[PDB]
Structure formats: structure tokens, C-alpha cells
Amino acid sequence: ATKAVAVLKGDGPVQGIINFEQKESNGPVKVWGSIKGLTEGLHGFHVHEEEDNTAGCTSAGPHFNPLSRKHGGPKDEERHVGDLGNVTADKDGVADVSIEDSVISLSGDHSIIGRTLVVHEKADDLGKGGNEQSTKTGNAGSRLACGVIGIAQ
């Protein structure tokens, strides 16, 4: 209890707010967020490193790769320990950032709090290996909006 915010803006013509809350620390986070301005259709939804950069992105590459994680969507068994998967945007570019993972947290350390959430150009791969960058990171396509997570109580 106590919410983190990620105001996602980055650089693309997108604007949104993640509201991260959970009962516990060691328990499943209830992600809800109301992102808009995306292009239509599927959009990868990944949390890259990028802590104390400036405010938003400046800096990050992979989906918080500790050494050699593999990609996977929600449905997959695996994932980088900074990807959830994707969302779908309607037409006002409005996505529905409703996720409930059981691996991450919003406490600290292995939590994703502090990290830069990113909304991406294409769908993520889901862990099929459409190509290869697929498994290596997730082949989301380019970064659009982003922001450091944690900015509430």
C-alpha cells in the first residue's frame, strides 16, 4: 500500500500515467495505467533500467538485463526481469495498462520502482522468436514514451 506513479511522456507524441499499487511488498503488483496518444494496435510495454538519468530516458538499452535473461511475454514462462509484455491502443491512442504480475514488486531491490517504464513502437515478440532480437531483448521497436517510476505516495 502506498502508490508509485510513472508519468510516461518520453519524446514520442504520447502522454500517460501508470499507478502502481500492491497490498504488500513481497506480493503481486496491481498495475493500472491510462496511457494515451499511441499509434493504434499493439505496443510493447517494457521497463528499462535508466534510474537517476535526468528525469526520463537518457541511457538505457535492454529490458533491465542483469546478465543474460531471455524475453517472454506475460504468457511465456520466461521474460527479462523488466518486461511485462505489451498493451493495445484504440484510436485516441488510448491504451489500457492493466497488468498483474507476481515476480516484480514496488518495494526496492528487485522491484521495478526507480526504473524507466517504456511504451514501444510495435508489439513485443512475446517470446516466439519472430527474428532473434526477440529472445535477446523482445524486439519491441523504438521507444516512444517513458518515465522513472515511483513518483507518488
Ligand SMILES: [Zn+2]
Ligand atoms: Zn524482454
